[PDB]
Design a binder for this molecule. Structure first.
Ligand SMILES: CCOP(=O)(COc1ccc(C[C@H](NC(=O)O[C@H]2CO[C@H]3OCC[C@H]32)[C@H](O)CN(CC(CC)CC)S(=O)(=O)c2ccc(CO)cc2)cc1)OCC
Lengths: 99, 99
């Protein structure tokens, strides 16, 4: 589909057997999601943006479905104020910017 | 153009007569540039990111050309980690997400 940017580009995703809402975010290298107790091993990480850094847990090879499009890659989990789908997963669903 | 997302979507912009590099950021509501000299009045503003809030200088109705496409809109100037073009100007240049 085509998503205009008059409003935030929010979509439903499926991850860890749960449904959530997340932003399709071309400004995020990697995907960052709200606290969720995912199974498996993880590695600590710190990620920065406007305002400074937060602590997150890096999970690898996680399956996410985004508007019916399946993808598999790194998900960072922590106290983010917003769920963002980053380029690591947007590339996998064939997402481009167009103007 | 059609821009894929395997790399950061960085483009050249022109503002205040100066060229700069900026990131097309669908996750940003607003356009935030690193510290720079811009002519005209400005009002102090606060904006929040992943790590908290920062103070910016808000410049309204600023001419800015993004990858060959003109916009005139609000530009926030302050300690952002990187120059970002947000949705307030992405809509002006007709930018959509497509997959
Ligand atoms: C419930 C209330 O939430 P809130 O207001 C904040 O909500 C938010 C809404 C959207 C975002 C997404 C963020 N956009 C953003 O910063 O936009 C600013 C300007 O425009 C305003 O609109 C939205 C906020 C304001 C950007 O797209 C992505 N970022 C990187 C860019 C930073 C500019 C480039 C380095 S990153 O997220 O930092 C990030 C860093 C590392 C990694 C791992 O690779 C992944 C993601 C973040 C928080 O609370 C405040 C305390």
């Amino acid at each position: 589909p085509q998503i205009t940017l008059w409003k935030r580009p929010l979509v439903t995703i499926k991850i860890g057997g749960q449904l959530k809402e997340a932003l399709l975010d071309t400004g995020a290298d990697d995907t960052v999601l709200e606290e969720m107790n995912l199974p498996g091993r993880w590695k600590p990480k710190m990620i920065g943006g406007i305002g400074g850094f937060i602590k997150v847990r890096q999970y690898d090879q996680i399956l996410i479905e985004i508007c019916g499009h399946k993808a598999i890659g790194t998900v960072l989990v922590g106290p983010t104020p917003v769920n963002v789908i980053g380029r690591n997963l947007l590339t996998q669903i064939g997402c481009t910017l167009n103007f």
